[PDB]
Amino acid sequence: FEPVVTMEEDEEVLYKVRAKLFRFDADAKEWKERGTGDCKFLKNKKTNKVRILMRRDKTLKICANHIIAPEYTLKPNVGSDRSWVYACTADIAEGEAEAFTFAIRFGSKENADKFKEEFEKAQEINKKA
Amino acid sequence: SMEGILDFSNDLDIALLDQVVSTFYQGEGVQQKQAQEILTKFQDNPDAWEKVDQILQFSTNPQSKFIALSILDKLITRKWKLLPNDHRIGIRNFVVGMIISMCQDDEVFKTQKNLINKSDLTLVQILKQEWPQNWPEFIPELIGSSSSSVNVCENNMIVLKLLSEEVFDFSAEQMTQAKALHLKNSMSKEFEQIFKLCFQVLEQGSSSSLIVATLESLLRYLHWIPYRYIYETNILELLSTKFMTSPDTRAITLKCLTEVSNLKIPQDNDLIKRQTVLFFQNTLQQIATSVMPVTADLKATYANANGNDQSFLQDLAMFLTTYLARNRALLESDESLRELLLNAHQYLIQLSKIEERELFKTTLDYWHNLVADLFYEPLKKHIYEEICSQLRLVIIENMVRPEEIQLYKSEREVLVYLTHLNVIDTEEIMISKLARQIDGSEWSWHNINTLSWAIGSISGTMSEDTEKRFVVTVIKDLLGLCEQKRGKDNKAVVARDIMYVVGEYPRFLKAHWNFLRTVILKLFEFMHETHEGVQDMACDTFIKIVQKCKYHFVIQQPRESEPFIQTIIRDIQKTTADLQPQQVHTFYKACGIIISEERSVAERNRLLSDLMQLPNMAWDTIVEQSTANPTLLLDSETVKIIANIIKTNVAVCTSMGADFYPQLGHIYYNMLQLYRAVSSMISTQVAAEGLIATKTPKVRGLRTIKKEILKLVETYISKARNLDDVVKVLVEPLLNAVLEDYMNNVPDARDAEVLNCMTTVVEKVGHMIPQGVILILQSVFECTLDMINKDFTEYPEHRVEFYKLLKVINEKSFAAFLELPPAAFKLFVDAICWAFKHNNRDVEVNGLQIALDLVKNIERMGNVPFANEFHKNYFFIFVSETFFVLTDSDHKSGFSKQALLLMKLISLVYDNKISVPLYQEAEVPQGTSNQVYLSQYLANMLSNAFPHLTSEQIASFLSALTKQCKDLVVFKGTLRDFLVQIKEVGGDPTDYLF
Amino acid sequence: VQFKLVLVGDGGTGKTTFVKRHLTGEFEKKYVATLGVEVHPLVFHTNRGPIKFNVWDTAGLEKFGGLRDGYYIQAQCAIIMFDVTSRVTYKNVPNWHRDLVRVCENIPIVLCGNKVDIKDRKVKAKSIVFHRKKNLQYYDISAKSNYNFEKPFLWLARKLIGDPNLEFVAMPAAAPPEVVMDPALAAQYEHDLEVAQTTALPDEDDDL
Ligand SMILES: C/C=C/[C@@H]1O[C@H]([C@H](N)/C=C/C=C(\C)C[C@@H](C)/C=C(C)\C=C\[C@H](O)C[C@H](N)CC(=O)OC)C[C@@H](O)[C@@H]1C
Ligand SMILES: Nc1nc2c(ncn2[C@@H]2O[C@H](COP(=O)(O)OP(=O)(O)OP(=O)(O)O)[C@@H](O)[C@H]2O)c(=O)[nH]1
Ligand SMILES: [Cl-]
Ligand SMILES: [Mg+2]
C-alpha cells in the first residue's frame, strides 16, 4: 500500500549564556541596547574559528555576529561588576561589517567571569587555527 | 522646488502638489521625509482651505484630494461660522455635487472608496454645523436622490451611518450638551422617513453592496431607535432569515441581531416574547442549514482561518452570549424550545474549544453567568447537565496559571460552581485526566501543569471527607508519576506540581499533622536542590503553607516534644545554607508569620530572638569590627553581608509588624550609626571620584544599605501599635541621622526613600511631633523643590515622594506651614501649582489634592488675618492656575479634581465666606462684592486667553458656572461645554442654559 | 512582500518606543513626541520567507498630529496602542479605532495594552472588552520587558499572508569576516573605549 504523500549546523556550541548586549553611541555618548538573549560561542567545524553569535529573544534576530579576535580585550565598565566592554572591528549582525564598542552584561559576576574565561579560551583557539 | 506649494503668494501648482503627495505616500527614505514636512506645512497653512476647490477639480491624484478634504474639515470644524452664509452654501453644494458626480461614474465609485468615504465624512461635518436649522431639506433630498441611482442610494446609506455615529455615538465629548440634544432630536424627528427608505431597500433590494451598506447604517440606528421599528415591522424576519442565508449580508446581520437583543423592550408582552424567541430560532436554523451544524468542529474551522470565518465565529459567540444572557429564561419555560436552547448552548461549547484567548474569555464570561445562575435558580440545573459536563472538560483543559490573575479567577469561579453542581463528574474528569498523564497518552509539562492548576482551583468545594479521599488519590498518583519519570527535568516539573497542589489544600494539611510535617521537611530537602526553579518553588510553597496553616506550627502538636517553629529555628542554618539571599529572606519572613501567631509575649520575643540569632551575631561582629576599624566598610563583601542582614530584618518586620519592636530595639542605635558611617563614605567617594561614583558597584552597595535601613524603619513605623515609643525612642535619632545628610548631599546623592520614610513618620505620628515636622520641612523642602522645578523629567522619584510628603504634612500638621516665613509659604503655593502643571498623575493628583486640602485648612481657620491674607495673596493664583490646566488640553486626566477645586474656590465667593475684599483699593467701588469682582476678573481673563470667544459666550459660561457651583456633575458639564466651545468659532451662548 | 502598517494611539503610550526596539533593539527611556509620522521598514524572517512592514508610526498628541487620518491611506494592517497605566489612553481607543476604520475598512488590527511591566496597572484586564465586537486581536505587551513583543507582528503576518501556521524563524547567520587592526586607528580606539568604560551601563538593577 502506497503511503500518504540558521547557518549554525556546521558549528559546535562551546559556551552559552544569557546576556544583554549594548553598543556605545558616541553621538549621544550613551550606551544603547542591541539585544537580550542567548550569547553563544560557536566553533566552525571546517575552519575551527570561534565566533560570538547572539540572537534577540522573541524575534531570534541577530544582535552579535563576529569572530572572537585574539586582539580583543575585555575591560570592566565603571557601573558594573558583571559586564565587559570591548571594541569589535567587524560585526555583521545588521549586514555590512562595522566597528562597535560593545558592552555585554550577564546575570551575575560569576557568569561574567566565566564568559571572560571562555572568551580567552576561544581567542587561543582562534590563534592556533 | 517641492517647497513651491508653500509659497501661497503665487497660484498653486497642482502637478507639483501631486508630486509632493506621491513622493510622501509612495516614496522612500530622504525624499518621503522632505515631502512629508512640506505637505504638513501646506495643510496647516491657515489659508490653505481656499486652495481646496482648485485641488478637488484639477488634481488627478486621489491622495491630493484626500488631503484637500482634511484641510476643508479643519475649516468646517473650527472656523465655519466666520464664513458668510453664501460661501457656506457654495461650499456645501460643491461637496454634495462632487459626491454625486463620483457616485454616477461606476468606475470611480468602485475604485475610489476612500475618497468617497472622506467626502461623505466632510459632508457630515457640514451637516453638524448646518443641519437642520440651515438645511431643512437635507433628508427629503437625500431620500429623493436615493431613488435616482443605486450608487447614490448606497452612498447615502454611508452618509446616514456616519451621521448617526457623529450624533449618537461620538457626540459626548465633541459637542456641547445642548448641541448634541439638538442633533439627536433632529435625527429622531426625521427617522420615520429614513427608516422607510432603509426598509424599502432591504425589502426590495438586489445589490448586495447596497444591502450591506443599508445594514451597516441599521447597526448604528439600533444604538438609539425605539424597538417598534424592529418588532412592529417585518425587519426582524428579514434579518433572521434572508440576510442570514447569504454570506455577503450574514456578518453585518448577526451584528445587527446582537444589538436587537440589547433593545429596550416591554417585559410583560407575550407577542414580543414570541418574536424574540422566533428571530433566535430563525437565526440558529439558518446557521445550522447554511453555515455549519451543531456538531461542527469550530476549533478546526477557526484555526484554518479561511476567509471571514474567524470574525463570523467571534460574532456568533457575541450573538449567542448576548441573547442567552438576556433571554434564556424564555427558552427554559416551554419544552418545545428545549432543543433550541440546548443547540444554542452546544454551539457555545464548540466555540469555547476554539484556541483563541480573547474569544475564550468572551464565552467564559457567559458560562460564569450561566453556572452562577444554576447554582442559585430553583429547578434549572437539570436542563444543562450535559452542557455542564462538557464545560467541566473545556475549563479543566484550559486552566491557566494563577499568575494570569483575572483569567485564572474567572476559570476557578466557573469550575467551583460546576464542581458544586456535580462533584462526582468533576472528580471523575480530573482522576481520568491524571491517568492519561500516568499512562503517557497525554503526558507533557504543559498538560500536567494545567491539570494541577485545575485540581488546585477547586479546593474548598468538596465536603471535608470527599476532599480527603480526592487529595490522597491525587497525591498518590502524582507521587507515582514523579517516580516513573526519568531525569530531574521531568521529576522537577511533577514535584513542583505536587508542591502546588498541596499548598492549595490547607484544610487537608490542618487535619493531617504528620502529612504537613512531612511536606515541610520535604520542602526543606528541596531547598538544597539547585535544579532551576526548585528552590524558589520550595520557598514559595513554604510561605504559602505557613500563611494558611501558621497556627499548626506555633502549637505543640500531639506526640511532638515542642512547637514546630522551634524545630524550624533550631535547624535554620542547615535549612537555608544553599539558598540565595532573596530565598533566605522569604524563609525568615515565613518564620516571622508563624511567630506573630504566638500571643504570649515572653514566648514570642524569645522566638524572635532565636530566629534573628544568625543575623544578630553577624551584625554584632560587624558592628564591633566596623566601628573599631571604619575601613572594613570598603570591603565589597562586608557591604553585601550588611545589606543582607538589614534585608532579613525587613523581611521579618514585614510579617511581624508591631511585634518586631524588640528586634528593632536591639539594632536601632548602631543601625543609625551605620547609616551615618555609610553616608560619609558615599560623600567621600563622590568628591574623590565624581558623580560617576554613584554608578559604581561599591557606592550602589552602600546606598542599598541606607535604603534598606529606611525601609526597615518605614515598615516598622507603618505597623507600630505603640506610638509613644515611636515618638519618644525612634523619631528623634532617625531625624538626626537622615535629615541633615539628605540636605547636605549633592542632588544626585540624595535618596528619595528619605522623603518616603518621612511620609510614613508624618502619617503615623505627625500629630505628636509638630517640631519634628517643621524640621522635616526645613531640611527637605527647598533643596528638593530646587531639584524638580527646572523641568518635569529630572529626579522622577523625588518629584513623586516630595508631593506625597507635602500632602501628608498638609493633612496632619498644617501648623508646620503656618510657621513658614511668607517667602517660603509663597514657594509652597508655587510648588502646588507646579504639581498641577505635571502630566504624571502621581504628581498632578497629589498637587490638586493638596490645593483642595489647603483651601479646606484655610477655611477652618475662620475669620483671622492669616486666612484673609491667604485669599488676598493666593485666591486668584489658584483660580487662574486651575483654569489654565483645565483649558490647555494637556491635563485631561486631572479634569475631575480640577473641577472640584474650581467649584470650591467659586463657591467660597458665592457664599460670601471670604470676609475681606479680594481686590486692592482703587480697582472697583469700595462697596463692590467679591462676587461681582470675581465675574469681572474671570471675564477679563478668559477674554484675553480666548479672544475668539464673544463676550456673550464668556458671560453666559460664567453665569452658568457660578449658579452651578454646588452641583459638581452639572458644573463639570458646563466646563466640558466650554472646552468644546473654545475649540471653535461662534459657539452658541445659550448652550450654557442646558 | 511588503505591507503598510499604521500605528495609532494616545501620546506617551509607547508606539515609537515599541517600533524602535523592534528596529534596533534599543529601549528609549525618554519621551520625545512624534511629529506627524515616522516611517521605517521592519523585516521579519518567516518559514514562508521574509515579510516587510512599512511602519507608519503616527503622532498621538493633537498638536503634533500632522496629516492625521491622511497617514492611514492604503494601510493593510494596524496596531492601536494604549497604556494600561493610563485609563484615558484606553478611553480614547474607540476614537482612534473610529478614525482608522473609516479610512481602512477591511484590515487586520491589533489592540495592544503597553506598559504591563508597571506593577500599578490602572486599566484592568476585565475592563478591556472593546476589541471583541470590533474583531480586533488584543495583546498585553511591554516594550520594556519585551512581554509578548513579537505577537502583534506575528498575528498580522499570519493574517496578511493568509497562513495560520506562519512562524518567525531564526534569520540565517553568515560567517563573519576576519579582522585586521589598522595601526593608524590605534590611539582612536583607546579614546573611544576609555569613554565607553567610564560611561555607566543603564539599569544595573535589572536581571540583565
Ligand atoms: C494523610 C496522608 C496520607 C498519605 O500520605 C503518604 C505519605 N505519608 C506522604 C508523603 C509525602 C511526601 C513524601 C511529600 C510529598 C507529597 C511532596 C513532594 C513534593 C514529593 C516529591 C518527590 O517525592 C521527590 C522527587 N523524587 C525529587 C526530585 O527529583 O525533584 C528534583 C502518601 C499518600 O499515600 C497519602 C497522601
Ligand atoms: N514602563 C514602561 N515604559 C515604557 C514602555 N514603552 C514605552 N515606555 C516609555 O513611555 C514613554 C513612551 O514614549 P513614546 O514611545 O515616544 O510614546 P508615543 O506613543 O510614541 O508618543 P507620541 O509620539 O507622542 O504619540 C517613554 O518614556 C518610554 O520610554 C513600556 O513597555 N513600559
Ligand atoms: Cl487553623
Ligand atoms: Mg511616538
Technique used to solve these coordinates: X-ray
For C28-144, strand residue ranges (E) read: 37-46, 49-58, 77-83, 109-114, 137-140
Which one of C102, C164, C198 has the shortest CB-CB distance to B304? C164
Q: Do B170 and C103 touch (CB under 8 A)?
A: no
- Alpha carbon B135 to its chain centroid, in Å, reads 43
Which helix (H) or strand (E) segment holds residue B860: the answer is helix B841-860
Distance from CA of A55 to the nearest CA of C (A): 8
> Cell match 499568575: residue?
B403
Q: Do A86 and C193 touch (CB under 8 A)?
A: yes
Residue of A39, A89, A98, A127 to mutate, testing the C interface (most C Cβ within 10 Å of its Cβ): A89
Query: Which DSSP category does C168 fall into?
Result: B
Return the sign of the alpha-carbon dihedral for residues B142, B143, B149, B155: positive
* Bridge partners, residue A17, by sequence: A39
Residue C60 CA, closest ligand 2 atom number: 25
Helices (H) and strands (E) in chain B, counts: 52, 0
- Give residues with Cβ within 8 angstroms of B664, minimum separation 6: B649, B653, B712, B716, B730
Q: For residue B114, which amino acid is it? A: N
Do strands A30-44 and A83-91 pair parallel, antiparallel, or not at all (unpaired)?
Answer: unpaired
Q: How far apart are CA C152 and CA C112, in angstroms?
A: 8
Say if C191 is an interface residue toward chain B (CB within 8 Å).
Answer: no
Say if C39 is an interface residue toward chain B (CB within 8 Å).
Answer: yes
Instruction: For residue C100, give its domain range.
Output: 1-208
Q: Do A80 and B697 touch (CB under 8 A)?
A: yes
Cβ C117 under 6 angstroms from ligand 2 = yes
- Give residues with Cβ within 8 angstroms of B309, minimum separation 6: B301, B302
Whether residue B284 contacts residue B311, with contact meaning beta carbons closer than 8 Å, is answered with no
Whether residue A101 contacts residue A74, with contact meaning beta carbons closer than 8 Å, is answered with no
Cβ C123 under 6 angstroms from ligand 2 = no
Q: For residue A91, report the phi and psi dihedrals to the nearest 5 degrees.
A: -110, 135
Task: Using alpha carbons, select from A70, A80, A91 the residue that is nearest to residue A113.
Answer: A80
Burial class of residue C57 (count of CB atoms within 10 Å of its CB; 0-12, 13-18, 19+)? buried
Say if C174 is an interface residue toward chain A (CB within 8 Å).
Answer: yes
Distance C65 CA to ligand 4 centre (A): 11
CB B374: neighbour CB atoms within 10 A? 20
Q: Give me the DSSP letters along B177-240.
A: HHHHHHHHHHHHHTHHHHHHHHHHHHHT---HHHHHHHHHHHHHHTTTS-THHHHSSSHHHHHH
- Calculate the alpha carbon distances from B796 to B788, B791, B843, C117 in Å: 8, 10, 10, 17
Whether residue B227 contacts residue B233, with contact meaning beta carbons closer than 8 Å, is answered with no
Distance B522 CA to ligand 1 centre (A): 8
3-state secondary structure of C177: coil
B696 to chain A: which residues are within 8 Å by CB? 78-79
3-state secondary structure of B111: helix
Distance C6 CA to ligand 4 centre (A): 12
Distance C196 CA to ligand 4 centre (A): 28
Distance C14 CA to ligand 2 centre (A): 3
CA atoms within 13 A on the CB side of B823: 1
Return the sign of the alpha-carbon dihedral for residues B186, B188, B193, B195: positive
Q: How far apart are CA B565 and CA B595, in angstroms?
A: 8
Burial class of residue B332 (count of CB atoms within 10 Å of its CB; 0-12, 13-18, 19+)? middle
Say if B692 is an interface residue toward chain A (CB within 8 Å).
Answer: yes
At CA B664, angle to CA B660 and CA B670, rounded to 5? 170
- Give residues with Cβ within 8 angstroms of B422, minimum separation 6: B385, B388, B389, B392
Whether residue B221 contacts residue B211, with contact meaning beta carbons closer than 8 Å, is answered with no
Q: Which ligand is nearest to the CA of C82?
A: 2
Resolution of the entry in angstroms: 2.1
Q: For residue B546, report the phi and psi dihedrals to the nearest 5 degrees.
A: -60, -50
Cell of B332: 427554559
Q: How far apart are CA C171 and CA A8, in angstroms?
A: 11
Q: How far apart are CA A81 and CA B697, in angstroms?
A: 7
- Which residue's alpha carbon is nearest to atom 15 within ligand 2? C14
- Calculate the alpha carbon distances from C2 to B197, C50, C55, C56 in Å: 43, 9, 10, 13
Question: What is chain B's Cα-based Rg?
Answer: 37
Say if C126 is an interface residue toward chain B (CB within 8 Å).
Answer: yes
Task: Render the burial of B280-317: b for 16+ CB within 10 Å, e for the rest.
Answer: bbbbbebbeeebbebeeebbebbeeeeeebbebbbbbb
Count of structural domains, chain C: 1
3-state secondary structure of A54: strand
Task: Using alpha carbons, select from C41, C52, C64, C54 the residue that is nearest to residue C4.
Answer: C54
Whether residue A78 contacts residue C197, with contact meaning beta carbons closer than 8 Å, is answered with yes
Q: How far apart are CA C26 and CA C7, in angstroms?
A: 19
Whether residue B876 contacts residue B918, with contact meaning beta carbons closer than 8 Å, is answered with yes
Q: Do C24 and A34 touch (CB under 8 A)?
A: yes
Cβ B475 under 6 angstroms from ligand 1 = yes
Which one of A21, A49, A57 has the shortest CB-CB distance to C146? A57
Q: How far apart are CA B739 and CA B730, in angstroms?
A: 14
For the beta sheet containing A30-44, the strands, ordered from the edge strand earlier in sequence to the opposite edge, are A62-67, A50-56, A30-44, A11-25, A98-105, A83-91
3-state secondary structure of C2: strand
CA-nearest residue to C145 within chain A is A36
> Cell match 582612536: residue?
C188
Return the sign of the alpha-carbon dihedral for residues B592, B597, B602, B606: negative
Which one of C171, C177, C197 has the shortest CB-CB distance to A75? C197
The alpha helices in B597-656, defined as continuous H runs, are 601-611, 613-628, 636-656
| Class level of CATH domain A6-128 | mainly beta
Cell of A13: 556550541
Residue of C40, C126, C130 to mutate, testing the B interface (most B Cβ within 10 Å of its Cβ): C126
- Calculate the alpha carbon distances from B797 to B545, B755, B769, B787 in Å: 36, 10, 26, 11
Helices (H) and strands (E) in chain C, counts: 6, 6
Q: How far apart are CA B809 and CA B815, in angstroms?
A: 9
Q: How far apart are CA A92 and CA A126, in angstroms?
A: 18
Cβ B652 under 6 angstroms from ligand 1 = no
Q: For residue C142, which amino acid is it? A: S
The residue length of chain A stands at: 129
Q: What residue numbers of C does the annotated binding site for GTP cover?
A: 10-17, 28-34, 60, 114-117, 142-144
Neighbours of chain B (3+ CB pairs under 8 A): A, C
3-state secondary structure of C70: helix
Return the sign of the alpha-carbon dihedral for residues B586, B591, B597, B601: negative
Q: How far apart are CA A98 and CA C82, in angstroms?
A: 37
Distance B499 CA to ligand 1 centre (A): 9
Say if C206 is an interface residue toward chain A (CB within 8 Å).
Answer: yes
3-state secondary structure of B155: helix
- Give residues with Cβ within 8 angstroms of B739, minimum separation 6: B754, B775, B776, B779, B780
Distance from CA of C21 to the nearest CA of A (A): 9
